[PDB]
Design a protein around this nucleic acid. Structure first.
Ligand SMILES: [Zn+2]
Lengths: 71, 84, 50, 119, 53, 154, 52, 125
RNA sequence: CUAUCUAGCGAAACCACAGCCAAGGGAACGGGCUUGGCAGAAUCAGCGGGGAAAGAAGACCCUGUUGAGCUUGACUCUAGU
RNA sequence: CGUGGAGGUCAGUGACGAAGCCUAGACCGUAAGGUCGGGUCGAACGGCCUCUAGUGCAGAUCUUGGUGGUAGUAGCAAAUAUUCAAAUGAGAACUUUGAAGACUGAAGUGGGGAAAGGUUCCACGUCAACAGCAGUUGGACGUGGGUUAGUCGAUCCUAAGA
RNA sequence: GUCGAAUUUGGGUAUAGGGGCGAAAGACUAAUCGAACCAUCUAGUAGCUGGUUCCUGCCGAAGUUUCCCUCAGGAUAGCAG
RNA sequence: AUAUUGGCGAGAGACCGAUAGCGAACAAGUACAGUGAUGGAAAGAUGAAAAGAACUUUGAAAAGAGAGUGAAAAAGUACGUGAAAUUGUUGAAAGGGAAGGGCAUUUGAUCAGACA
């Protein structure tokens, strides 16, 4: 998932099971004060949900990951 | 052959998971389960299966509400604030 | 199957998390009669009927 | 270990509701450091602190709605008594103590008198 | 790396190896028990055809 | 860690042991009796000639319908074999008992393997699958080994 | 207990098999399924004349 | 002998009410006697043991070894004393699990809610 | 390609105790008993005489005051009409 | 005569070793059985007068558990076939690479899928067990990583039917 | 043997125990069918077969009479303690 | 006043003592088998305390031999005592198509006490 943060503007999160791609696009707007191009979603085989949200071309993914604190 | 060559043609399930007791008994063609009849109101239970009520009666589970009723009776179903 | 329902994917994801040995710090408690994980399934031996 | 509920009853409604968000901010940063540091035992206390806030928020709104329905004929089925279903469908102590006008005239004229046996 | 998760919480790197080798044997005697006891009444069929005469 | 009926003194001895070894019991027994009483320098020379298919191991007790051979003549028997897994586990203990008689101070020039016995370890089960749907046992026959070398006193 | 030993549903195998005529637990996949039941000679069975 | 019908004389009912006692009914189970000065000073026979009490041993192979209560391990029904220990062959010095009955209290870790506790047992200052 | 010999791996059926014959008598066809013939460790590959070899409380026959399938104008009833 | 428990008694025996178990050691009794020495072992147990019974085993194609002889034996023989060097390794008929030799031969031993399985996929460690020889390899063990949809399917509609 | 059809076959659905279904064999109905499987009444009943646990002492039989849907069994008389 | 083999809380026993007592003293209606109704086990004990064997040396390693802990590893997580079947080493003796047993003695081994 670090390859998706560094190459593309793709932030990867583990989201709660009841979220539906509008509650994730709006969460990253409200939590991180950014804009989101597009959210993708899969349900991991350990039964949790993983969301490939994607920042849009002027927000950078490395700066948001460093302000969060997982580098 | 009726044995080993005919056990190879078994790849279509006839029961699936029941929704009210959660075990593979919900028969798909009849659309009714067979350990407890699920589209029925009352659960399926028979006194000829005395053992098969031990596995399913009151007490084999969490008893999320019923385990406190014996304590609430002793104090007398009181309410309100507690104490000092 | 591949195209599967959600209430069997919810069941095989629980079986993934239960496909774990005993944690090794369990064997060090005071009255610890447990010695291994006896409910441990493997897809070769025991099919789960879900 | 962080918050203590006797110091949260005093704080007003909008002070709690901004304290609760400040705990959820701290809780979410702690689930980042857990990804990079194996043990993190402080995360127990922050998770028991948003429960202590939320039980104080709900404590006040149950109380404020109870005096809103105080003395009314009908209050909601969340503020009525959780006695068992057999007790709520039972006669009240006035309804059980209702006797006919003929059986009431008898009890005032010929009551059960107490007495002994010797003279 | 979840290998340090062991090293802070009881278990050592050496204690895991001698612990699992006991543990992988504690399941060995039980499966040797299951094969031995069941081997009497496992050939005991019900509806055998007897392909002779 | 007690041993068999060793009728020698422990002061001039050195011992080794193997337990739950997955060799065959009926072959490691006849290997251990081919070298009983011998000198240690001559048992080690002999036991690796077996691996080169000279000087076979004389099978005496567990020898029903094994094949006859010509290398059994020097023992006065007509049925001998060259068990390879058995001698590799007995060589591994003569090398361990000749390493404990250096650490105890004895001289390896006049050691002799005085007491050596094998036993029966707890078996290890498997299944074999027979005709008409039957299941039968398929077990290993493992063996404990004890071994005592001793200086030749008078 | 009056239902001690009479919990199982064991029916005797008959005589065409090469084992005694005691009632035997039916089924499979457990070690018990095949074993004797319902008797006093059996392990897990009754006692003779259960105390009343 | 027993005279009320609320107390049991059963073996099994009295060992299950010991081995599964909760960790606050184990507080009174782990009482310890006071020395023959504190019984004249305060006036009790025994107090429930507490961490950081100064204590003395009267039974066992560690007899007559003063110390201090370092931890009340009231899960193994044992207490541990520092300044006495057991030096392992590895070099570790694990402590010893004593029982509070085989001790005697010499210096008492006074406190509120223990100053008041001694007073309800008829004690003094 | 097996069998055969070797290295590794390694079961099962079966088994009162077991295993050389002749005649005798015997539950009327003995490996054992009785009288004779005799008889030398350990054994390997074959073999199908014997072990009334193994397989399964005879599937035939008889007995049971034991059943079941089926039939009819058997006895006693019955849905239906 | 022996056994599990009960009332009574011997102010019985016992951590200086009770019960058990072993013993081609001794003694008593017609016998059932009793007593003693030795070895082992570690926490309770006997004599006698009476009470009571879930009380004495060689068998029941007895029940459960355990173990043998057979026996290092029957055998591990369909699907054309393997060989050389090197590397790793304590260890190579069997793992990896290279060099040969071959086979399935486009109704394949190829590439995909529906059922069904459920993490077997993939990497890093590792060989106690499993892979009916082997093992350094593995669909095994240990830890992790991995499945992204406005257009692909479900969802929608009806069929025989529920 | 048949191989373009009374063909073969997937998935869906229908019919369930004295009932189903049958181009008919009493065939098939989950290795079960001249009546499935599971639990219960049930430890069904048996005039029939097998087994029936310590020692010593003293006494010690019967296979016969009569009746019985009686003849592998009972009652009764006998012998015995 | 009466009934109660379920529920809740108590007290008790000429009861059973891990093949017993409930199916279950233990992660037991658990693992596992069956499409399904249903069927359904096995499995308790180191020591007072883990003091669960630091260190040395042989081995590729498991392990071994020392050492050490302990009242005791003839208690080392395969852990109380540890019977028999069956098995190994050592010691004694016997052996022409079985072995075993009964009476009697020779020979070897072994045991013995009133007078000792
Ligand atoms: Zn259901």
């Amino acid at each position: 998932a670090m390859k998706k943060v560094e190459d593309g503007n793709i932030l990867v999160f583990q989201v709660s099971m009841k979220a539906n791609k509008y509650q994730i696009k709006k969460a990253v707007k409200e939590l991180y004060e950014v804009d989101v191009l597009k959210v993708n979603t899969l349900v991991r085989p350990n039964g949790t949900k993983k969301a490939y949200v994607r920042l849009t071309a002027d927000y950078d993914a490395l700066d948001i990951a460093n302000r969060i604190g997982y580098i | 052959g009726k044995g080993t060559p005919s056990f190879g043609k078994r790849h279509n399930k006839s029961h699936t998971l029941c929704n009210r007791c959660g075990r593979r008994s919900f028969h798909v063609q009849k659309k009714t389960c067979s350990s407890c009849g699920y589209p029925a109101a009352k659960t399926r239970s028979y006194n000829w299966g005395a053992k098969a009520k031990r596995r399913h009666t009151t007490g084999t589970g969490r008893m999320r509400y019923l385990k406190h009723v014996s304590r609430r009776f002793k104090n007398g179903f009181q309410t309100g604030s507690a104490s000092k | 199957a591949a195209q599967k329902s959600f209430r069997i994917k919810q069941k095989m994801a629980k079986a993934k998390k239960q496909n774990r040995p005993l944690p090794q710090w369990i064997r060090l408690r005071t009255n610890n009669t447990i010695r291994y994980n006896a409910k441990r399934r493997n897809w070769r031996r025991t099919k789960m009927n879900i | 270990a962080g918050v203590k509920a006797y110091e949260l009853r005093t704080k007003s409604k909008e002070q709690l509701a901004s304290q609760l968000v400040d705990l959820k901010k701290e809780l979410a940063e702690l689930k980042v450091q857990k990804l990079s540091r194996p043990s993190l035992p402080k995360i127990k206390t922050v998770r028991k602190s948003i429960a202590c806030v939320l039980t104080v928020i709900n404590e006040q709104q149950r109380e404020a709605v109870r005096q809103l329905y105080k003395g009314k004929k009908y209050q909601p089925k969340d503020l009525r008594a959780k006695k068992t279903r057999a007790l709520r469908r039972a006669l009240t102590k006035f309804e059980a103590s209702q006797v006919t006008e003929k059986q009431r005239k008898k009890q005032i004229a010929f009551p059960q008198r107490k007495y002994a046996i010797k003279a | 790396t979840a290998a340090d998760r062991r090293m802070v919480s009881g278990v050592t790197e050496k204690q895991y190896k001698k612990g699992m080798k006991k543990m992988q044997q504690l399941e060995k005697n039980a499966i040797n028990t299951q094969i031995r006891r069941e081997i009497k009444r496992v050939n005991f069929q019900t509806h055998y055809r007897d392909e002779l005469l | 860690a007690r041993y068999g009926a060793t009728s020698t003194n422990p002061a001039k001895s050195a011992s080794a042991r193997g337990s739950y070894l997955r060799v065959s019991f009926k072959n490691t027994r006849e290997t251990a009796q081919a070298i009983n009483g011998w000198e240690l320098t001559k048992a080690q020379k002999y036991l690796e000639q077996v691996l080169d298919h000279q000087r076979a191991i004389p099978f005496r007790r567990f020898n029903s319908s094994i094949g006859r051979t010509a290398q059994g003549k020097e023992f006065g028997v007509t049925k001998a074999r060259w068990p390879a897994k058995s001698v590799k586990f007995v060589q591994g203990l003569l090398q361990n008992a000749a390493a404990n008689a250096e650490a105890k101070g004895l001289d390896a020039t006049k050691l002799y393997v005085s007491h050596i016995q094998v036993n029966q370890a707890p078996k290890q089960r498997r299944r074999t699958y027979r005709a008409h749907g039957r299941i039968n046992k398929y077990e290993s026959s493992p063996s404990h080994i004890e071994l005592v070398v001793t200086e030749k006193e008078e | 207990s009056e239902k001690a030993g009479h919990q199982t549903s064991a029916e005797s195998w008959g005589t065409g098999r090469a084992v005694a005529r005691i009632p035997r637990v039916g089924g499979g996949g457990t070690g018990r399924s095949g074993q004797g039941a319902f008797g006093n000679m059996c392990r897990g069975g009754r006692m003779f004349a259960p105390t009343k | 002998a027993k005279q009320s019908l609320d107390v049991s004389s059963d073996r099994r009912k009295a060992r299950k009410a010991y081995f599964t006692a909760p960790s606050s009914q184990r507080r009174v189970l782990l009482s310890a006697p006071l020395s023959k000065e504190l019984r004249a000073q305060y006036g009790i026979k025994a107090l429930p043991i507490r961490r950081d009490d100064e204590v003395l041993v009267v039974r066992g192979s560690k007899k007559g070894q003063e110390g201090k209560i370092s931890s009340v391990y009231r899960l193994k029904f044992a207490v541990q004393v520092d300044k006495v220990t057991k030096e392992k062959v590895n070099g570790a010095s694990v402590p010893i699990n004593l029982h509070p009955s085989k001790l005697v209290i010499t210096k008492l870790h006074l406190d509120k809610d223990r100053k008041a506790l001694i007073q309800r047992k008829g004690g003094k200052l």
